[PDB]
């Protein structure tokens, strides 16, 4: 009865059984929305059950009988109270069920189109979840229902708001970015919806610029796509062109065309590094997606980074020359450690402090970049380590500890390792340096642990059986087999002459198995290697280098000029970056080419 | 270990597999010099094997006709 | 490896729990293992997701 | 009329070297109807042997614009034989 009676009736959809006991709602002084009729397990109501079972011919009578009773809270706006499934409404079910007719009945009956489903299921979880946003408008767009969203926006009663934000501040466009997964089917779904909402946005809210809206974390949809790694939608937004009616909605324009020669004008509203928290800064450091290097090679990004790089080649090589001069003094001072020597030590101490302050400032500016991607900032720690040791070593020399000599030469060899960081500025060895750590060091580390287990495992057996004399010496002699200087022979004075040789012979065989298999293990990485992948890493490495040095040195925060030229498109002025291309298969902002 | 020419010459002998690494007892810093020497030996294996891998991709991603065409041009010249 | 160690150690043959949840399909009860997948190219035992 | 501007010269930057003559522009832009009218115009016909500022003729300009692209190669090859075929009818003596 009551709760059980109603749910069984609405499940079949018969309205005849619904007739009767409708006056009992007023007679019993109990409301349908109250907890008596809704299920206490999740707060689901009979209307939600009726919408679930499909259009249920009982939807209209159920809303008809409710208005007969005096209900302070409207049933169609009821929200589920379960923590896992919070904020879901009957409108969301109708949109999910892909029923355009059902959505119309609820909306025409006073349904709120701004109810938020803030349940744990609707949040971005690592487990079971579905983050379509938080609004009924976002659900229709994410589910690829163009008919529903058009009706919701153009509803004569209670139209949906495009600028309505989610619990995270995400708008409709933001939700499209989050649901992107770079799949060929998903990319078409997101791209098609993104332009459609933008086109409809001009007609509905011409004044409001939906692209400039930022969420609670201050990210525009273009910026959000870059950070989240959604390259497919990011590429479409970066270069976008439309027809005459939607020309201002575009970002890529044509300045002039002459035969096969064309010039393109990509917008730099939030892409140029001049503005704080730009796409380039977000991609290089804030972004943590594995396909981070695939973004810097895009059509407008590759040319912009190359233009920025060329303007700073001399400054980059000036730093390399200054660092090289620093080690010219360091090597000579280290060589003659035991007149100008006092001057040499003074310059080394200042140099150690100089790099220490700059590296500390670099880590002070950004710290999540090192944690997010240790591979990208591998040399950042090494420069800090060399600077710290050099400064510390000079302190011990002045402190008369006599302990400085091992530390001073440690910074010498470790610093010369840091000289290979500047090899990324050359296209020949810069790409070659990619396999130095990315391909090789990702697997050769495992072999070292394996070798020491074998090395120390055999060393203890060799020294114990022969008692060749010490654990340090036995391991040292076993290590000499790797460099081909091992000395294996049939000892005559050994108590167990044949046994120690057998273990030694067994050890020699294992290294050939170990070393050759290690050669084979990294062999497959080279064979199954993408040529563009190595090239893209180098482009990202240069992009990070230019961005860090564009801000200038730590003491002198030199002002940065804004790349591009301000010009009017049509009266809106947008900075644009010229890209010139030649297309022979083609068979304008300005008339005269320049 | 005594001269810059001799120290570099001994370090070069590790490439041909004739390097002599040992725990010196008369050295003032016996453990430290071995550690740097041990570090150097490890780097050559990284250097040489990566160099073998670096030129490995050239052979794998090589066009058979490209090598043949170069020889034809060489004979033509 | 997991199958051998699921039976437990030799001296202590620890009892093994049954993976999955017993539930009715339609009245037949069959143990089932939940697998969750996301498909964007698609364009029910229970009504309310859990 | 010759367009000897810096834009029409073979530059490493922004440029478009179609030659130096209106006849060369039509051939390089793949307009067979224009070039046929220009050559067979009853008044002031275009000259096939007219040279550019570099001495390049119409055929020379076709060579320069070639970029070995599949679309470009078809464009250059189709124009090259067409001009040669029309050259026999217009200027049989001139090679
Ligand atoms: C074929 C390889 C990779 C090496 C190449 C050089 C030579 C002489 C020995 C070979 C070899 C075996 O043919 C077999 C083993 C396994 C035996 C080790 C435990 C008894 C090791 C082992 O180095
Ligand atoms: C795996 C490789 C390529 C070689 C093969 C021979 C052996 C015993 C050493 C390996 C090895 C590491 O496994 C790791 C490093 C890096 C450490 C150098 C700085 C501490 C070097 C290093 O030669
Ligand atoms: Na050898």
Question: Is A435's Cβ below 8 Å from some Cβ in B?
Answer: yes
Alpha-carbon distance of B43 to B46, in angstroms, equals 5
D22 is written with which tokens?
Answer: 């209106």
A475 is written with which tokens?
Answer: 């391991």
> How would you classify residue B17: left for phi > 0, otherwise alpha for psi between -120 and 50, otherwise beta?
left
With contact defined as 3+ CB pairs under 8 Å, the chains touching D are A
A107, A70 contact by CB (below 8 A): no
Q: How far is the CA of A511 from the centre of ligand 1 (A)?
A: 9
- Nearest ligand, CA B19: 3
Residue having the nearest C-alpha atom to atom 23 of ligand 1: A509
HSE (side-chain half, CA atoms, 13 Å) at A21: 14
> Of all atoms in ligand 2, which is nearest to the CA of residue B46?
3
Alpha-carbon distance of A393 to C12, in angstroms, equals 59
DSSP secondary structure code for residue A592 in this structure: S
Q: Cβ contact (<8 Å) for D16 and A258?
A: yes
Alpha-carbon distance of A577 to A565, in angstroms, equals 7
How open is the CA angle A188-A579-A174, to the nearest 5 degrees? 35
In order of A25, A63, A83, A111, the CA distances from A32 in angstroms are 7, 11, 22, 16
How many helices (H) and strands (E) chain A has is answered by: 26, 4
* DSSP H or E segment with residue B38: helix B30-60
Q: What is the resolution of this structure in A?
A: 3.2
Gap between the terminal Cα atoms of chain D: 23
Q: How was this structure determined?
A: cryo-EM
> Of all atoms in ligand 1, which is nearest to the CA of residue A513?
3
Alpha-carbon distance of A418 to A388, in angstroms, equals 14
Q: Which residues of C touch A98 (CB under 8 A)?
A: 43
DSSP secondary structure code for residue A307 in this structure: H
Alpha-carbon distance of D74 to D86, in angstroms, equals 18
> How would you classify residue A264: left for phi > 0, otherwise alpha for psi between -120 and 50, otherwise beta?
beta
**Domain limits for position A162:** 3-294
Identify the CA nearest to A420 among candidates A541, A279, A508: A541
Q: Cβ contact (<8 Å) for A128 and C48?
A: no
Which among B22, B50, B57 is the nearest to A476, CB-wise?
Answer: B22
In order of A20, A46, A69, A84, D12, the CA distances from A5 in angstroms are 11, 10, 19, 27, 84
Alpha-carbon distance of A35 to A44, in angstroms, equals 10
A228 is written with which tokens?
Answer: 């989240």
With contact defined as 3+ CB pairs under 8 Å, the chains touching B are A
Identify the CA nearest to A155 among candidates A196, A98, A186, A200: A200
D91, D48 contact by CB (below 8 A): yes
Alpha-carbon distance of A555 to A577, in angstroms, equals 31
Question: Considering only residues 8 to 27 of chain D, which have any Cβ-Cβ distance to chain A shorter than 8 Å?
Answer: 14-16, 18, 25
Alpha-carbon distance of A360 to A362, in angstroms, equals 5
Ligand 1 pocket mutation, candidates A488, A505, A513, criterion most atoms within 8 A of CB: A513
CATH number of domain containing A157: 1.25.40.20
Ligand 1 pocket: which residues have CB below 6 Å? A 506, 509-510, 512-513, 516
HSE (side-chain half, CA atoms, 13 Å) at A418: 23
Q: CB-based contacts of D19: which residues, under 8 Å, 6+ apart? A: D25, D27, D28, D52, D56, D58, D60, D61, D64
Question: Considering only residues 561 to 580 of chain A, which have any Cβ-Cβ distance to chain D shorter than 8 Å?
Answer: 580
Query: Dihedral, CA atoms, A400, A405, A407, A408, nearest 10 degrees?
Result: 100
Q: Buried b vs exposed e over A77-107: b needs ≥16 C-beta within 10 Å? A: bbbbbbeebbbbbbbbbbbbbbbbebbbbbb
Alpha-carbon distance of A380 to A362, in angstroms, equals 9
> Of all atoms in ligand 2, which is nearest to the CA of residue B49?
3
Q: Which residues of C touch A144 (CB under 8 A)?
A: 43
Inspect the structure and tell me whether chains A and C have 3 or more CB pairs less than 8 Å apart.
Answer: yes
Alpha-carbon distance of B2 to B7, in angstroms, equals 7
> Of all atoms in ligand 2, which is nearest to the CA of residue B41?
23
B35 is written with which tokens?
Answer: 């550690």
* DSSP H or E segment with residue A575: strand A573-582
Q: Which residues of B touch A405 (CB under 8 A)?
A: 29
Neighbours of A481 (CB within 10 A): 17
Alpha-carbon distance of A228 to B16, in angstroms, equals 50
Provide the CA A570 distance to its chain's centre, in angstroms. Answer: 35
Q: How far is the CA of A375 from the centre of ligand 2 (A)?
A: 18
Question: Is A584's Cβ below 8 Å from some Cβ in D?
Answer: yes
Query: Dihedral, CA atoms, A236, A238, A241, A245, nearest 10 degrees?
Result: 100
* Residue C22: strand pairing partners: C31
Tell whether the torsion through CA atoms of B13, B19, B23 and B24 is positive or negative: negative
């Amino acid at each position: 009865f009551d709760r059980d009676r109603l749910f069984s009736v609405v499940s079949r959809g018969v309205p005849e059984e619904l007739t009767g006991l409708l006056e009992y709602l007023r007679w019993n002084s109990k409301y349908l929305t109250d907890s008596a009729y809704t299920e206490g397990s999740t707060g689901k109501t009979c209307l939600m059950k009726a919408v679930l079972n499909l259009v249920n011919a009982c939807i209209m009578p159920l809303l008809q009988i409710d208005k007969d009773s005096g209900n302070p809270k409207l049933l169609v706006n009821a929200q589920c109270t379960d923590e896992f499934y919070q904020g879901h409404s009957a409108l969301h079910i109708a949109i999910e069920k892909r029923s355009l007719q059902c959505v119309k009945l609820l909306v025409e009956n006073g349904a709120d189109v701004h109810l938020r489903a803030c349940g744990r299921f609707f949040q971005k979880h690592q487990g079971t979840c579905f983050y379509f946003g938080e609004l009924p408008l976002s659900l229709a767009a994410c589910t690829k229902q163009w008919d529903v969203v058009t009706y919701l926006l153009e509803n004569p009663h209670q139209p949906a708001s495009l600028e309505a934000t989610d619990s995270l501040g995400n708008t409709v466009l933001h939700a499209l970015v989050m649901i992107a997964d770079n799949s060929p089917e998903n990319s078409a779904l997101v791209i098609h919806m993104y332009d459609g909402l933008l086109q409809m946005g001009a007609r509905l809210c011409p004044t409001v610029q939906l692209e400039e809206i930022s969420n609670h974390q201050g990210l525009t949809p273009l910026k959000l796509a870059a950070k989240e790694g959604k390259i497919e939608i990011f590429r479409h937004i970066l270069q976008r062109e439309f027809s005459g009616p939607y020309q201002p909605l575009s970002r890529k324009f044509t300045e002039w065309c002459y035969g096969p020669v064309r010039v393109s004008l990509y917008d730099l509203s939030s892409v140029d590094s001049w503005e704080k928290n730009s796409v380039l800064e977000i991609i290089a450091f804030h972004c943590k997606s594995p396909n981070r290097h695939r973004m810097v090679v895009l059509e407008p990004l590759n040319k912009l980074l190359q233009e920025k790089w060329d303007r700073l080649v001399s400054r980059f090589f000036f730093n390399f020359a200054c660092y090289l001069v620093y080690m010219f003094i360091f090597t000579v001072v280290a060589y003659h450690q035991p007149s100008m020597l006092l001057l040499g030590h003074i310059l080394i101490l200042l140099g150690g402090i100089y790099l220490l302050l700059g590296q500390l400032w670099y880590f002070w500016r950004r710290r999540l970049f090192i944690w997010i991607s240790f591979m990208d900032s591998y040399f950042e720690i090494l420069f800090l380590l060399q600077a710290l040791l050099t400064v510390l070593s000079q302190v011990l020399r002045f402190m008369e500890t006599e302990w400085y000599l091992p530390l001073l030469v440690l910074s010498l060899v470790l610093g010369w390792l840091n000289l290979l960081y500047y090899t990324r500025g050359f296209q020949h060895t810069g790409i070659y340096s990619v396999m130095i750590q990315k391909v090789i060091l990702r697997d050769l580390l495992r072999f070292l642990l394996v070798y020491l287990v074998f090395l120390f495992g055999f060393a203890v057996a060799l020294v114990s059986l022969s008692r060749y004399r010490s654990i340090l010496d036995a391991s040292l002699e076993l290590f000499k087999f790797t460099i081909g200087m091992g000395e294996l022979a049939f000892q005559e004075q050994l108590r167990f002459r044949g046994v120690v040789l057998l273990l030694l012979l067994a050890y020699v065989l294992l290294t050939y198995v170990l070393l050759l298999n290690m050669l084979i293990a990294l062999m497959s990485e080279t064979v199954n290697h993408v040529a563009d992948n190595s090239w893209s890493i180098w482009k990202l490495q240069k992009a990070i280098s230019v961005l860090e040095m564009e801000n200038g040195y730590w003491w002198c925060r030199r002002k940065k000029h804004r790349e591009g030229r301000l010009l009017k498109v049509g009266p809106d002025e947008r900075w644009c970056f010229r890209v010139e291309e030649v297309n022979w298969a083609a068979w304008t902002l300005s008339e005269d080419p320049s």
